[PDB]
Amino acid sequence: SITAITVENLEYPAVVTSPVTGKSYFLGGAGERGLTIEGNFIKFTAIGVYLEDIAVASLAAKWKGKSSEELLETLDFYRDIISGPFEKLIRGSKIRELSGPEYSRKVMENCVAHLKSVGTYGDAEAEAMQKFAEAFKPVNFPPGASVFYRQSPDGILGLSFSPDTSIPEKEAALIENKAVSSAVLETMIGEHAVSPDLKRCLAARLPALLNE
């Protein structure tokens, strides 16, 4: 039943399969991010969050039978999605052109704030974030180009870059750090993520799946 979602002419298929891990995912939600300039929301990128198919069985126990409205207001629900025992794939496709450094600046800012916020920002995490930064430096994201974050439940964050929206065969880098591995998704649907579009998609789409 899960449908595809299109954001600013950028389409997010209902399902995708990783060329890296071979695992298949379903679209949990899609939205957009940007900057508010002079009270005006300026869109820069689209974001899609895919959850490994096994996520359903994992989330079923605790969340089956809950209404979308109920899930949306429950922080614990999103915590299970962020740190659940399954892989998550996040695809960011640019609406406006951004260089790797330009784009990564904000993302890293948000990740670092979160990490410090929960008391897990030591030397290992700073080094992981520096490696994160390094991976983006040689990259440019013209409209339509994409970044793929593969959040492995084993504490690893795989980074892939594409000239368009197709998922690359090989990953550009592997950030091996547990706390950092979930930081990116946390800044998107975690408690302190202001933008609700992704959270709403998840709360709306998951109930149907959690019942069958």
Ligand SMILES: O=C1C[C@@H](c2ccc(O)cc2)Oc2ccccc21
């Ligand atoms: O996926 C993104 C894009 C990022 C961003 C937007 C505009 C820009 O110029 C640089 C980075 O903002 C964000 C903030 C929070 C969570 C995800 C994101």
